[PDB]
Amino acid sequence: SNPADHFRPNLKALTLYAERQHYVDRWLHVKERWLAPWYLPWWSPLFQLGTWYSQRSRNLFLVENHLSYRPYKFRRNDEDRNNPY
Amino acid sequence: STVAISVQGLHYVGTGLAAIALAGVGLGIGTIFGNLLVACARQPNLTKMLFNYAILGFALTEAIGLFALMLAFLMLFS
Amino acid sequence: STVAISVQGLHYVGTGLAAIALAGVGLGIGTIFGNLLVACARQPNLTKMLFNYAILGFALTEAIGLFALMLAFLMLFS
Amino acid sequence: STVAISVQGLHYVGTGLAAIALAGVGLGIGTIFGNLLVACARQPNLTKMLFNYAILGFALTEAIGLFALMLAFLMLFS
Amino acid sequence: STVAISVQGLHYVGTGLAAIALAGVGLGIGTIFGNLLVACARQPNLTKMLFNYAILGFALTEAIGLFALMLAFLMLFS
Amino acid sequence: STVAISVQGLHYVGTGLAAIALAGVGLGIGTIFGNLLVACARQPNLTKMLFNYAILGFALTEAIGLFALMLAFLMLFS
Amino acid sequence: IALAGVGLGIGTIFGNLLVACARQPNLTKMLFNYAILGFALTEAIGLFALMLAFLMLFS
Amino acid sequence: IALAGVGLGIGTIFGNLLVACARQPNLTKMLFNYAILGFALTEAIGLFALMLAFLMLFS
Amino acid sequence: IALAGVGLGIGTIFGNLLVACARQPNLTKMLFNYAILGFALTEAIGLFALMLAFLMLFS
Amino acid sequence: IALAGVGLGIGTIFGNLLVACARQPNLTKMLFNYAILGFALTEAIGLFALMLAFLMLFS
Amino acid sequence: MFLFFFCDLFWLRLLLCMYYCVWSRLCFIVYFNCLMLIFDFLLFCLFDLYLFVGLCLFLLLWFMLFNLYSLILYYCITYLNLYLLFCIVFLLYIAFLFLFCFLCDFFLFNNLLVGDSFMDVFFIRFLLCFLECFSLLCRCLSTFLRLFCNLLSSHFLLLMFFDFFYFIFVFFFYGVFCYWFILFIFVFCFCLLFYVFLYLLDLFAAILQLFIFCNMILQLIMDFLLFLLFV
Amino acid sequence: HDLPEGFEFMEHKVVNKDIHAPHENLETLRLTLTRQDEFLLREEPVKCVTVTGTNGEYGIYPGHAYKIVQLNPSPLTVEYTDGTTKKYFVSGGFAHINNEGSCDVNTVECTLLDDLDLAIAEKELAAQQAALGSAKDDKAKSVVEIRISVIEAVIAALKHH
Ligand SMILES: CCCCCCCCCCCCCCCCCC(=O)OC[C@H](COP(=O)([O-])OCC(O)COP(=O)([O-])OC[C@@H](COC(=O)CCCCCCCCCCCCCCCCC)OC(=O)CCCCCCCCCCCCCCCCC)OC(=O)CCCCCCCCCCCCCCCCC
Ligand SMILES: CCCCCCCCCCCCCCCCCC(=O)OC[C@H](COP(=O)([O-])OCC[N+](C)(C)C)OC(=O)CCCCCCCCCCCCCCCCC
């Protein structure tokens, strides 16, 4: 155990936490702000690049109908194999 | 009934098994040098070159033995 | 009666057994280099070409040991 | 009396035993390439054909290794 | 239920396994000397350079045997 | 719960394993003498120097055997 | 099991002996003596293992 | 299991016997005697393992 | 497991036989007889191993 | 596990067969027939091991 | 989760800035074979076979700054993680593979179908092609696994031996003044010999493993190179 | 102006057996024992021939595989199908064995073992051993040792029978 502990980075300085929802929402706000102006038509390749793949992924998530249960990505405890909740 | 048991002494057994891997490594190293002697007597002009390749093979063969020896230490010290 | 038992030191045994596979890999490597040394003395002009093939075998021989080494970790750390 | 016991940790031993089968595959590959080097020195004009046959032999041995790993992974998980 | 068990005599088992690692080491050393005799008989003038390389191979092979022996004695006193 | 168990028949098992290493030594002896005869036939003039080197190989191989044998007897009486 | 190597080791000596004798039939006596020497040395280890087996059998 | 190292050792002797015979076949009558001698020693080792296999199987 | 040594030993004898026969085909008859002799000996050891198996499986 | 000593023995026979065919390429038929004989004998040993394996498996 | 940390090369970066503000020749390279792919004259390749030189040199420099200096006690291999090495090897290997595939020359893969027309196509050649396609990815995985495991095992062994040496040196040196001084002297000499041997072995093995790491990539590249002859 | 090659005037060529051919059971080996461009025996059918090459002794019977042997100073035996043994002594050369059933043993010198004298051989060994003691340099000693090896082989060859 102790010898195994010698293989860690030795210059850790700071750790920051952020919820997926929050920064995803902020990114969406930024994307809307930059893609909103009239001088960027919806048919431009840039706008489609920005929007279409995200729309496709979200639609795929919504359409999903799985017989099994997928535990919440951001639980408080995900180390117990016998407690998905 | 649900019973959970934790045997401490098993780590010794796993450690001894890994040591068996050294039998192949130790034998493999001897194989290289045996060929080296039988090769130097067939072409002594290259003895220095052959000696270099033999040492290279020894390290590669030895490197594997260390992998097993690491696992021995991991279990012997946990 | 239905009895469930969980022995918590058995993964040491499985790890050691997988480590034993490294003896064959070590021996095979020694065999390759033994053949290399005895083969270079026969056709020295092609020494370099033989060396490249020798390393190729090592690449295709060390990889197998990694699978066994991989299983060791999958059981040693679980 | 009728007693039923279910040990959860015995799949580690089975996985380790299956992993031992790789020692033969590793040694067999070493034998293939050891002879390849000797053969190339003997008749270097046929290096490509010998290399092709050696690869074929390695593939068959690797296929056996895959079967052994399949059993190892199955027992490890199942 | 949580049950902790400590088996004493297991260290004897692990130590014996490490002793088996000396089988290949002993065999490997014998292989080197056997090859040495042939090389000397086929090239009698090189009775010293071959002898030196044989000693070098023995030392490396002896080292591997000593790595296992350290675990063999260590577990016996653990 | 903390349970301490002392098995008094496992000092036999470790002893038997330590004896297995003798096979790797005994076989090593035959290899040296297996090739000594060939060397003598190849170069009968060196029937003496080859014999001395073979004795050196046998003694060194036997040294490994006795190192293993020491562990065998220690666990037999302890 | 220690006898497995000892028995095999003897076969190796008596295998090469035939090749050596066929190559140099004039030296059968000297080769034969060395083969006996090797057999005795291997047998010594065989008795060591045999001694341990019997001790653990009647103990 | 010790028999594995005995039966294999026997095969090794005979394998070398064929080569020795196929090298100089006029010495077959001499090599064959030596080959039997080797079989007489390795087989003797197998008896010791067989003895233990019987003592423990009937005790 | 003892059959592993017997099976390998039998293959070893025949392996040398092919080399010996190719070297001197004129002696195939004599070599073949000796090869069978070796098989008759290695298989005999196998009988003991099987006998022990049948003497413990049916016990 | 006994099959391990069987498959290896079979590989030994064929490995020597190729060399024998290379040394004496006109004697392929006799070598091929003898190799088949060795395979049958070795395979018979493996079948005996399989017999015990199935007997215990269904017992 | 966002962790801010630093590599352990800042002093080495300072030394590089100090000693390489002026030009200097380079004549010794760990993997020289990336510069000489063609050995028979009049053979030339239309593919950018020399594209790997810069990456090879940079990787050698980076891994040598890390691994070789790791022998110094307490020096940290900041990148020593299995999946990080996997990402590195994935980048390199898959980049070259996609460079070959984007070429849109399907005939380039004809050699995957091993054997000749004599062999049964479905039961032999197709299986061999499957195995070789698998073997490419296995080669990638093996490269990264080998690089990881060599370092891990070497440093574990070094740490354990150093701990044992410290223990015996500190708590058993008084035996020099005692009647059993000879045993301690023998043990100390053996430990010194082992120390030297381990350091030499690790020094050699690091460079050798870098050589092999680069050689696997170069072999991938060479497996799909075709050389034209000048006329 | 093209000149004939000196082998065109030789009408006894070497017959090689095609690899893709059936085997034949042969009871006779056609031996050609030659010394200094002179055949002592010519395509003679014999039962077997024993030759002492560098690695060891070879007993060649009909059908022996293709091989080339570098002889050493030693006796050579020829046993006929009748049951008669003829023993020569050679100082060196080569022996070519063909799978077709032929053996061409070309020697620098091939003398019947009867011609050699053991008394002359014995006293020569004593003289050469004295010469080796007085040998000036390493080369001279090596040459003297070559003579002794041949002499001892001759002495041992005659003492055998
Ligand atoms: C809230 C708290 C604060 C933190 C906020 C953070 C916000 C985060 C937002 C979310 C981010 C999410 C994702 C994070 C992923 C992180 C991954 C990671 O860490 O990977 C490891 C990985 C480690 O890489 P590495 O191999 O160690 O090499 C990177 C090194 O930087 C070395 O690489 P290099 O050497 O190759 O780099 C080139 C280098 C080439 O070399 C140099 O240039 C040499 C200098 C190197 C400087 C950089 C090294 C820093 C060393 C440690 C700090 C130094 C001391 C600081 C003192 C602070 C005191 C409180 O040049 C530079 O660095 C250029 C900058 C030079 C600045 C010089 C300034 C001079 C000012 C002079 C003023 C004079 C005034 C006079 C007035 C007089 C009046 C009379 O990190 C990176 O690769 C970089 C990660 C950065 C991600 C972006 C983060 C967002 C930006 C944050 C800026 C905050 C500024 C405000 C701070 C105020 C004080 C509190
Ligand atoms: C190309 C091959 C290069 C070979 C280099 C060979 C170097 C030989 C060094 C001999 C011994 C040196 C001893 C130094 C002692 C320092 C003080 C001390 O206490 O150290 C103890 C330390 C550790 O000793 P320790 O383990 O006894 O420490 C005990 C301390 N306690 C008890 C607290 C744990 O010494 C070392 O770690 C030295 C190991 C050196 C290994 C070789 C490293 C080579 C790679 C780095 C080269 C860097 C070159 C950079 C050049 C510029 C580049 C641009």
Curated annotation (Swiss-Prot), chain K:
It comes from the Eukaryota. One of its GO terms (biological process) is proton transmembrane transport. Its main location: mitochondrion. It is a multi-pass membrane protein. It is found in: Mitochondrion inner membrane. F-type ATPases have 2 components, CF(1) - the catalytic core - and CF(0) - the membrane proton channel. CF(1) has five subunits: alpha(3), beta(3), gamma(1), delta(1), epsilon(1). CF(0) has three main subunits: a, b and c. This is ATP synthase subunit a. It comes from Trypanosoma brucei brucei. The lineage of its organism: Eukaryota, Discoba, Euglenozoa, Kinetoplastea, Metakinetoplastina. The gene is ATP6.
